[PDB]
Amino acid sequence: YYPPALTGLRGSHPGAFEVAHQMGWEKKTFDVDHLPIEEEYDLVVVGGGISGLAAAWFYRERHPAARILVIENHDDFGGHAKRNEFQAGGRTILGYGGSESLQSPNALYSEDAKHLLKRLGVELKRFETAFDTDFYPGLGLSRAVFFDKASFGVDKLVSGDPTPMVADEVPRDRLNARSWRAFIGDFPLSREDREALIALYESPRDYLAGKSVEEKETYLAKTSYRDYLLKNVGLSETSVKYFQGRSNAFSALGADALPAADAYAAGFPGFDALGLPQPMDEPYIYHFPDGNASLARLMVRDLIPAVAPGRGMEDIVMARFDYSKLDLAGHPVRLRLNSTAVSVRNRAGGVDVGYSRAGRLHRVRGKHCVMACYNMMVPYLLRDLSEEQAHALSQNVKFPLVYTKVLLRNWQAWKTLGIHEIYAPTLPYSRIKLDFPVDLGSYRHPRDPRQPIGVHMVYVPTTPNAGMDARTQARVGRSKLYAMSFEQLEKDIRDQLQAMLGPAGFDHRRDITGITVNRWSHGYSYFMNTLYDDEAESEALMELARSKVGNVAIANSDAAWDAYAHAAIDQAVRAVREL
Ligand SMILES: Cc1cc2nc3c(=O)[nH]c(=O)nc-3n(C[C@H](O)[C@H](O)[C@H](O)COP(=O)(O)OP(=O)(O)OC[C@H]3O[C@@H](n4cnc5c(N)ncnc54)[C@H](O)[C@@H]3O)c2cc1C
Numbered sequence: 001y002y003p004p005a006l007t008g009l010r011g012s013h014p015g016a017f018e019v020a021h022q023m024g025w026e027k028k029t030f031d032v033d034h035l036p037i038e039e040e041y042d043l044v045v046v047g048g049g050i051s052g053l054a055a056a057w058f059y060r061e062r063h064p065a066a067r068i069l070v071i072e073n074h075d076d077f078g079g080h081a082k083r084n085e086f087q088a089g090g091r092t093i094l095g096y097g098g099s100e101s102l103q104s105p106n107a108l109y110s111e112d113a114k115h116l117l118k119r120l121g122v123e124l125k126r127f128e129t130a131f132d133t134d135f136y137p138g139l140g141l142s143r144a145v146f147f148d149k150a151s152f153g154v155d156k157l158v159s160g161d162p163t164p165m166v167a168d169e170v171p172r173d174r175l176n177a178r179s180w181r182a183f184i185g186d187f188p189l190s191r192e193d194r195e196a197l198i199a200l201y202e203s204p205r206d207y208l209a210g211k212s213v214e215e216k217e218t219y220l221a222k223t224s225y226r227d228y229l230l231k232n233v234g235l236s237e238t239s240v241k242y243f244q245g246r247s248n249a250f251s252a253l254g255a256d257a258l259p260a261a262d263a264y265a266a267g268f269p270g271f272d273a274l275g276l277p278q279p280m281d282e283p284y285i286y287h288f289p290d291g292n293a294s295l296a297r298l299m300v301r302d303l304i305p306a307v308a309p310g311r312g313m314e315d316i317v318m319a320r321f322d323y324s325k326l327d328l329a330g331h332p333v334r335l336r337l338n339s340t341a342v343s344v345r346n347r348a349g350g351v352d353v354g355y356s357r358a359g360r361l362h363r364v365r366g367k368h369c370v371m372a373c374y375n376m377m378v379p380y381l382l383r384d385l386s387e388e389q390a391h392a393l394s395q396n397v398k399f400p401l402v403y404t405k406v407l408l409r410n411w412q413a414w415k416t417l418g419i420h421e422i423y424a425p426t427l428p429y430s431r432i433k434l435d436f437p438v439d440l441g442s443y444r445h446p447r448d449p450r451q452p453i454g455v456h457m458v459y460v461p462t463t464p465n466a467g468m469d470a471r472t473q474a475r476v477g478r479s480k481l482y483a484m485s486f487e488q489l490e491k492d493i494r495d496q497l498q499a500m501l502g503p504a505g506f507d508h509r510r511d512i513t514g515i516t517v518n519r520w521s522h523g524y525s526y527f528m529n530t531l532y533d534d535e536a537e538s539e540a541l542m543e544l545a546r547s548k549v550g551n552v553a554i555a556n557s558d559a560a561w562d563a564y565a566h567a568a569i570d571q572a573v574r575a576v577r578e579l
């Protein structure tokens, strides 16, 4: 039993969601109050992502003798933080299934989050040498933009992209980029379109001239980035398609759904002459080879020492995890996989929890409970919620995303084209890249273009320019993914890689040796969007949603309306203190 070596349809895989949807879609209830209580714990945690694991860890720090049960519906622990493995050339190649890197941790990680990192042996400075920052730039590789036939008349890859991005691992002086005029000059757009794009960068003007600074901020909060480019900068409908998908990977929405103020904060072009006040700079290098799955693995090994030997950040990378040790009776911490919580109820100074596993209901009991699952799931579980609080929890509509890992036999085609990363403005996969090169522990990142390498590509099922709000794009994105077979997902992967790399000799039937699709149908937590949400009413809803209910506290990154691992930790810490 070893989920990380499984390929194919992963993420929220078949088997993980069916009981959840029986509750969510069919409104079936699974009451367990006529079943005998089978086990008792000090703490029961619903949900085995980073938030739930942190809740267990901080609970145990406060109560060293505590008996803790973690209930998790997927076949692996970690929630969005998942380890993916490939076997190639007799060596393991690691990928991350979801939760990707520690985001600007020097600036954003709270005291408690840094305390967890220290106790687990994670030294942030180690990544200043573990991350091979100059590997790809030193090979002369650059980022590129792929324009597709269907939207631009021709397939064309344009390299040398100088576009600075929010979470950038490449030092600016090492982008191997070209001037805006040279770069944009190769775009397969009309001469007029190209000269307006170049002017955007070479001749910024105050597109909101006359307005005060406060009026500009108000306008930009209620205007989408796409409408600002269209109505105020004056770009054509064809020119703005270049910007449609740029924000998909980081925000799970396109330029039609992001306020122009948020594009400004993320360094998008078009604001340089508006006279706006100061708001991206921390190097994006805090990346284990399996992403933030290493954080989950570090906590699990620390909470359940029998699952794996070693201590510290180095030996976790290749540590062998024995999943049969996760849920042993008598062990004070038990992690119960493949299990959907269906009921949570305060009773007699404690909490009764029902869960379903392999089609059968079970009842356990805790002194305390932390609900670290998707917040939208809580109203279907927590029988004590007021109607007001249940409605608030349901307002956190999460964003769907797909992280796909592809094993290439070699990456000579990437070398030939001079690229390590591609942006595709109007294709399903908007970001395709050679994986981050990290050496940590005994793991060595692939180096030889003649030999296998992992590729990472992000697909966000947006519905741009439709007049939808963000919650509706998210829901509709999930219906689209629900309609797609694995075979359909694989055809998109293969078709796009063939069209982008094919001119340099790539043959997808021969050069792809592995595919892992991490389908995160419920991905990023919702976040307050000033195009569609009132800030004061959103703050109130968020605060109400996560209010403690007896001895049941609410966590997950969802509870912060903030899709980050440090939010997951901070929300768990708040949940544990409330108990
Ligand atoms: C594709 C992707 C990439 C990301 N990249 C980054 C990144 O680079 N940096 C960063 O800081 N953050 C990133 N994130 C944010 C990510 O959500 C957090 O980092 C963190 O992994 C979330 O932890 P969590 O415990 O709050 O939620 P989750 O990881 O989602 O854990 C909640 C768990 O509870 C389970 N659950 C739900 N209902 C039930 C039930 N009834 N019974 C039992 N279990 C249940 C869910 O299935 C899930 O496994 C990314 C997210 C996604 C989707």
Ligand code: HEM
Binding pocket: 012, 013, 014, 016, 017, 020, 021, 023, 024, 025, 073, 374, 376, 377, 380, 394, 397, 474, 475, 476, 478, 479, 481, 482, 519, 521, 522
């Ligand atoms: C294959 C993976 C999945 C797909 C394709 C999928 C798809 C969908 C769709 C289309 C909806 C309706 C739109 C919405 O309300 O957001 C939905 C809702 C829901 N999903 Fe999923 N989902 C998946 C996985 C999961 C998982 C892992 C869970 C929880 C363990 C889950 C729990 C729910 C719940 C509770 C709802 C109802 C939300 C509400 O009523 O507020 N789903 N899902």
